[PDB]
């Protein structure tokens, strides 16, 4: 076995050396060829020769331009059966419910545990408004029932696909929308409670859609409100607390 192995190793080394030698000879041939490139090309240029398209070739070019003129179809995917859709929907529901139970029992998604956290805590045209005030100015002249109309138009005008960075603009708009929802509740609405109800819930539904894609941006704004109100409670106590706070907390339960 050992002798057979040594011959195999010797043969492999022997073939490797032959390949290297062949590689070396080739590079020398290329180098010699490059040196003689100018002489060969000079004569070839001297011997350069002096200066109807097929029916299949004529038809293609005719077809291409006609296709360019012609309108294009939108593509579609195969329709899943009702049983398959229900099975997929049931499967997704099972996965989400199982995740909720795990999160309840102490599973954290950075799948770390609550005990890990408790180490060392005790010892120590349409404009997209990047700010809450900007949204008001855009909707300053519009009625109370018209807030959902403008808000959805802003999202439509700045979808992610339309231009680069629209995700960020919508992400900031998610934070801006939440303050608008809380802001309206602070304003008096006993005069037109019905109209306020038609806008207050509608904006929340839009915020729910935004949160699905921009939960991170919403979460940052939500934490800021928690910090801000706490500071206001430090100085004003119950006077800081308003209806918008009570509204504000409910929305986290929703979202």
């Amino acid at each position: 076995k050992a002798e057979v192995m040594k011959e195999v190793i010797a043969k492999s080394k022997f073939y490797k050396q032959e390949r290297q030698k062949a590689q070396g000879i080739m590079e020398d041939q290329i180098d010699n060829l490059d040196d003689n490139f100018e002489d060969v090309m000079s004569e070839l240029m001297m011997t350069q020769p002096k200066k109807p398209k097929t029916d299949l070739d004529k038809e293609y070019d005719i077809k291409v331009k006609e296709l360019q003129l012609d309108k294009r179809a939108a593509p579609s995917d195969r329709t899943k059966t009702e049983e398959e859709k229900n099975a997929e929907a049931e499967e997704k529901k099972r996965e989400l419910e199982q995740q909720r139970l795990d999160r309840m029992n102490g599973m954290i998604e950075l799948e770390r545990g609550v005990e890990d956290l408790d180490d060392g805590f005790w010892e120590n045209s349409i404009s997209c408004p990047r700010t809450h005030d900007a949204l008001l100015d855009q909707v300053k002249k519009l009625d109370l029932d018209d807030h959902p109309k403008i808000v959805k138009n802003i999202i439509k005008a700045y979808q992610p696909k339309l231009a680069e960075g629209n995700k960020e603009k919508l992400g900031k708009f998610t934070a801006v929308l939440l303050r608008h929802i809380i802001f309206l509740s602070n304003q008096n609405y006993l005069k037109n409670v019905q109209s306020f109800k038609r806008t207050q819930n509608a904006l929340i539904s839009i915020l729910k859609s935004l949160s699905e894609k921009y939960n991170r941006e919403l979460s940052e704004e939500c934490r800021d409100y928690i910090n801000e109100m706490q500071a206001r409670y430090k100085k004003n106590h119950f006077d800081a607390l308003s209806n918008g706070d009570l509204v504000f907390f409910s929305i986290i339960g929703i979202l």
């Binding site: 240029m45 350069q48 002096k50």
Partner: protein, 56 residues
């Protein structure tokens, strides 16, 4: 990127006369309309990759 490089290749006088500021490739396949890139030591064709001396 170079913008409107084509404008730079040829010059127009007040009378409308057009003069070419660069040499054209002599390769038959390149033909007329193929301009050589002017380097400090050589004239280079971007189509044929041929190299010509500046003062040839």
């Amino acid at each position: 990127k170079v913008k409107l490089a084509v404008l730079s290749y040829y010059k127009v006088d007040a009378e409308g006369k057009v003069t070419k500021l660069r040499r054209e490739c002599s390769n038959p396949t390149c033909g007329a309309g193929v301009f050589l890139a002017n380097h400090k030591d050589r004239l280079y064709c971007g189509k044929c990759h041929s190299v010509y001396k500046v003062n040839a």
